[PDB]
């Protein structure tokens, strides 16, 4: 039978623990509490971004649930950054490393205090995988709860027209204004509308994709991802999350009993079915690594080839998470995939029951057909994300799936985004070019920046469907099937992307899953002698440490 106190007997039990008991009294524990499991309630609450604002009330509601189930909760805090506020300046270099700092933050507190289990609360992009990575690493009972999505805003423009707007509409408005196609007054109108109050980005970006993936991994209560941050149903999910973690301790269940290979395959299938963020490839690889579970880029290909793209969601589709909530949330996609034999029903979850048993209990409706397509009428018969291999990316790369044709182009090679933006401004990027931005990898950037300026400018210059964008970094906001990221090995590791020179020919076959450089292997291989990595830009502090310890993007840019 499970010990409901697998760690906290180190601080509560026996003559020798008098000093620890004396300190725990001073945070409120009394005689009756020392026999209870201790639950760490880790919140990335802050006011530096709206994404995290709901986590204060939700952590409180988690503590109420832990108490309701006979546990003792202890709240603590960790950082997040704003993936939105950090865009367009030096802060973009500090987004992905925040993931590592959050996972380490949770590990250190849980290990130091000998807590038995956790509930982990996150809002903004990198804090979700940061928490899930800590949960995997610790292999204690753990429940993940999301902040919830922001509500959509509506801009009134100068011509009397109106549009629903989000972050991307603010960046695009700036671009329209710079090309003389939009007034500064109309950029102002969009700015005032995009973010009304608390909640993470409403589109299918990293936060909503990973909140959906956490339901799919069985690490969040089914139905918990979709209700908006402002919606008090989140409070109920919070109290039930605190109750659930105490029951996992009673069962002797830990995070690695839930994070099995099959649970990761269920996350891949759900992310493929939502046309989730390509960032979910990086994060799910990293979470598998932290859970000591074998997972490769090819597992993404294999599962993704069998799962249709169903969700018509921003940024590439029409709808936002509040619309997915309205038609029944993530359980609708999970039930559709289970009924089609595309989900492992027998995966244990944080309910203490299997994915199939959870879905039987809540009986989601069928896909509505607009927000989530019917399985027989999908956006694409296979996954919303495509994994590539070939001579340019022998350790793999990722691209959002298109309808389209094969692309061949003459390589145009840049060390960093700034160089490519300059070349675009000077007219040296034209139809048929393959634009290659290298030294943007985990080590090269450093931090593997999500670049939005080059995709924005290519679209603005009308070159959206005529140019191929390729990077060892990441892209946001480009044309489906024409922005390739995560090219491994990255330039700093002397991968083929580092050997490229202006004029080399590149071929991308998305349907055939191939990204090749057309140069004679022998001739191409011997330029290897000339490769030299630029010296690290950041020689002190968190980014200097990151560059020393970080792995390839091909295995999730893990540091441990």
User: Should residue 24 be labelled a site residue for ligand FES when binding is judged by CB under 6 A?
Assistant: no
The 121-140 site mask, x for binding ligand FES (CB under 6 A), equals ---xx---------------
d(CA 113, CA 367): 45
314 marked among binding-site residues: no
CA-closest candidate to residue 330, choices 354, 355, 350, 352: 355
User: In the annotation, is 44 catalytic?
Assistant: no
User: Should residue 169 be labelled a site residue for ligand FES when binding is judged by CB under 6 A?
Assistant: no
What is the CB neighbour count within 10 angstroms for residue 3?
12
Residue 199 tokens read as: 């909640």
Least distance (Å) between residue 392 CB and Na ion = 20
Residue 526 tokens read as: 């011997």
User: Should residue 230 be labelled a site residue for its own copies when binding is judged by CB under 8 A?
Assistant: yes
Most distant CA atoms of the chain, gap in Å: 77
Measured over the CA atoms of residue 91, residue 94, residue 95 and residue 96, the dihedral's sign is: positive
Q: Which of residues 41-70 bind ligand FES (CB under 6 A)?
A: 49, 51
User: Should residue 108 be labelled a site residue for its own copies when binding is judged by CB under 8 A?
Assistant: yes
* Beta carbon nearer to ligand FES, 51 or 74: 51
Q: Of ligand FES, its own copies, Mg ion, none, which one sits near residue 124, judging by CB under 5 to 8 A according to partner kind? A: ligand FES
Q: Of Na ion, ligand FES, Mg ion, none, which one sits near residue 419, judging by CB under 5 to 8 A according to partner kind? A: Na ion
* Chosen residue from 157, 177, 340, 419 binding Na ion by CB under 5 A: 419
Burial 170-183 (b: 16+ CB within 10 A, else e): bbbbbbbbeeeebe
* Beta carbon nearer to Mg ion, 68 or 377: 68
What are the φ and ψ backbone dihedral angles of 240, each rounded to 5 degrees?
A: -70, -30
* Beta carbon nearer to ligand FES, 49 or 401: 49
User: With left for phi above 0 and alpha for psi between -120 and 50, is residue 477 left, alpha or beta?
Assistant: left
Q: Of ligand FES, Na ion, Mg ion, none, which one sits near residue 56, judging by CB under 5 to 8 A according to partner kind? A: Mg ion
User: Should residue 104 be labelled a site residue for its own copies when binding is judged by CB under 8 A?
Assistant: yes
Q: Which of residues 315-334 bind its own copies (CB under 8 A)?
A: 326
Preceding peptide of 409 cis, ω within 30°: no
Least distance (Å) between residue 280 CB and Mg ion = 11
Please answer whether residues 348 and 475 qualify as being in contact, where contact means their C-beta atoms are separated by less than 8 angstroms. Answer: no
125 marked among binding-site residues: yes
* Chosen residue from 4, 6, 24, 434 binding its own copies by CB under 8 A: 24
CA-closest candidate to residue 97, choices 123, 122, 130, 121: 130
Q: Of its own copies, Na ion, ligand FES, none, which one sits near residue 197, judging by CB under 5 to 8 A according to partner kind? A: its own copies
450 marked among binding-site residues: yes
In DSSP terms, 309 is beta-bridged to 380
User: Should residue 153 be labelled a site residue for ligand FES when binding is judged by CB under 6 A?
Assistant: no
Q: Of its own copies, Mg ion, Na ion, none, which one sits near residue 441, judging by CB under 5 to 8 A according to partner kind? A: none
User: Should residue 422 be labelled a site residue for its own copies when binding is judged by CB under 8 A?
Assistant: no
Q: Of ligand FES, its own copies, Na ion, none, which one sits near residue 416, judging by CB under 5 to 8 A according to partner kind? A: Na ion
Residues 6+ apart with CB under 8 A from 241: 62, 65, 119, 143, 145, 220, 221, 224, 350
* Beta carbon nearer to its own copies, 125 or 265: 125
Stretch of 255-263, 288-296, 413-421, 496-504 lying at the interface with Na ion (CB under 5 A): 413-421
51 marked among binding-site residues: yes
* Chosen residue from 1, 112, 294, 376 binding its own copies by CB under 8 A: 112
User: With left for phi above 0 and alpha for psi between -120 and 50, is residue 5 left, alpha or beta?
Assistant: beta
Which residues are at the interface with Mg ion (CB under 5 A)? 56, 60, 83, 125, 206
* Beta carbon nearer to Mg ion, 75 or 186: 75
d(CA 542, CA 269): 34
The 77-96 site mask, x for binding ligand FES (CB under 6 A), equals -----xxx------------
In DSSP terms, 119 is beta-bridged to 41, 143
* Beta carbon nearer to its own copies, 250 or 545: 545
Classify 451 as helix, strand or coil: strand
Residue 225 tokens read as: 């991802």
Q: CB nearest Na ion: which residue?
A: 416
What is the CB neighbour count within 10 angstroms for residue 160?
6
Residue 140 tokens read as: 């204690």
User: Should residue 207 be labelled a site residue for ligand FES when binding is judged by CB under 6 A?
Assistant: yes
Please answer whether residues 405 and 439 qualify as being in contact, where contact means their C-beta atoms are separated by less than 8 angstroms. Answer: no
CA-closest candidate to residue 386, choices 490, 206, 515, 545: 515
C-alpha angle 544-548-553 in degrees, rounded to nearest 5:
110
User: Should residue 416 be labelled a site residue for Na ion when binding is judged by CB under 5 A?
Assistant: yes
Residues that bind ligand FES (rule: CB under 6 A) add up to a total of 11
H-helix segments, 426-525: 453-460, 496-499, 521-525
* Chosen residue from 25, 179, 418, 548 binding Na ion by CB under 5 A: 418
* Beta carbon nearer to ligand FES, 19 or 376: 19
* Beta carbon nearer to Mg ion, 64 or 408: 64
* Chosen residue from 109, 201, 244, 267 binding ligand FES by CB under 6 A: 201
Residue with tokens 């893990």: 558
235 marked among binding-site residues: no
Residues that bind its own copies (rule: CB under 8 A) add up to a total of 115
d(CA 87, CA 206): 15
- Which candidate in 476, 532, 544, 552 is catalytic? 476
User: Should residue 548 be labelled a site residue for Na ion when binding is judged by CB under 5 A?
Assistant: no
Residue with tokens 């109420």: 64
Please answer whether residues 204 and 275 qualify as being in contact, where contact means their C-beta atoms are separated by less than 8 angstroms. Answer: yes
Residues of this chain that interact with ligand FES (CB under 6 A) are 49, 51, 82-84, 124-125, 200-201, 205, 207
Binding-site members for [2Fe-2S] cluster are: 51
Contact residues toward Na ion (CB under 5 A) are 416, 418-419
Q: Show which residues are catalytic.
A: 476
């Amino acid at each position: 039978v499970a010990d409901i106190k697998p760690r906290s007997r180190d601080v509560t039990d026996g003559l020798e623990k008098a000093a620890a008991r004396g300190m725990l009294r001073a945070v409120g524990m009394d005689d009756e509490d020392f026999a209870k499991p201790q639950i760490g309630v880790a919140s990335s609450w802050n006011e530096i971004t709206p994404c995290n604002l709901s986590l204060d009330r939700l952590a409180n509601a988690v503590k109420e649930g832990v108490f309701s189930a006979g546990g003792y909760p202890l709240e603590f805090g960790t950082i997040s950054v704003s993936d939105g506020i950090s865009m367009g300046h030096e802060g973009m270099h500090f987004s992905l490393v925040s993931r590592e700092v959050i996972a380490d933050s949770v590990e250190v507190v849980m290990q130091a205090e000998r807590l038995d289990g956790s509930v982990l609360l996150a809002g903004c992009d990198k804090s979700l995988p940061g928490m899930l990575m800590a949960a995997a690493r610790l292999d204690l009972a753990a429940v993940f709860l999301y902040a919830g999505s922001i509500l959509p805003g509506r801009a009134k423009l100068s011509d009397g027209s109106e549009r629903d707007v989000t972050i991307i509409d603010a960046f695009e408005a700036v671009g329209a204004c710079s090309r003389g196609l939009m007034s500064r007054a109309d950029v102002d109108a969009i700015e005032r509308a995009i973010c009304p109050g608390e909640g993470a980005c409403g589109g299918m970006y990293t936060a909503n994709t990973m909140a959906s993936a956490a339901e799919a991994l069985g690490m969040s209560l089914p139905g918990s991802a979709a209700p908006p941050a402002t919606d008090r149903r989140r409070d109920g999910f919070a109290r039930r999350s605190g109750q659930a973690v105490v029951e996992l301790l009673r069962r002797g269940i830990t995070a690695r009993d839930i994070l099995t290979k099959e649970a990761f395959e269920n996350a891949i299938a759900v992310v493929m079915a939502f046309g989730g963020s390509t960032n979910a490839v990086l994060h799910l690889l990293a979470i598998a690594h932290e859970a000591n579970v074998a997972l490769s880029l090819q597992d993404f290909s294999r599962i993704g080839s069998g799962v249709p793209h169903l969700a018509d969601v921003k940024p590439f589709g029409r709808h936002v998470m509040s619309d997915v909530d309205h038609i029944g949330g993530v359980p609708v996609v999970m039930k559709a995939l289970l009924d089609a034999g595309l989900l492992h029903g027998d995966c244990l979850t944080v309910t203490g029951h299997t994915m199939a048993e959870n879905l039987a209990a809540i009986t989601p409706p069928d896909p509505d057909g607009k927000v989530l397509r019917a399985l027989a009428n999908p956006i694409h018969p296979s996954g919303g994300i495509t994994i590539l291999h070939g001579s340019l990316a022998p350790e793999g790369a990722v691209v959002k799936t298109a309808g389209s044709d094969v692309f061949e182009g003459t390589a145009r090679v840049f060390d960093g985004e700034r160089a490519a933006l300059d070349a675009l401004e000077d007219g040296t990027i034209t139809v048929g070019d393959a634009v290659v931005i290298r030294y943007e990898g985990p080590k090269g950037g450093p931090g593997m920046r999500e670049m939005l300026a080059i995709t924005g400018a290519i679209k603005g210059a009308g070159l959206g469907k005529d140019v191929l964008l390729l990077t060892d970094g990441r892209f946001s906001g480009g044309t489906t099937g024409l922005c390739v990221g995560h090219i491994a090995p990255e330039a700093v590791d002397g991968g083929p992307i580092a050997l490229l020179r202006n004029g080399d020919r590149i071929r991308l076959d998305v349907a055939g899953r191939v990204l090749d450089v057309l140069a004679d292997p022998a001739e191409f291989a011997s330029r290897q002698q000339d490769f030299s990595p630029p010296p690290p830009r950041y020689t002190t502090g968190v980014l200097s440490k990151y560059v020393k310890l970080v792995s390839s993007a091909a295995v999730g840019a893990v540091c441990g």
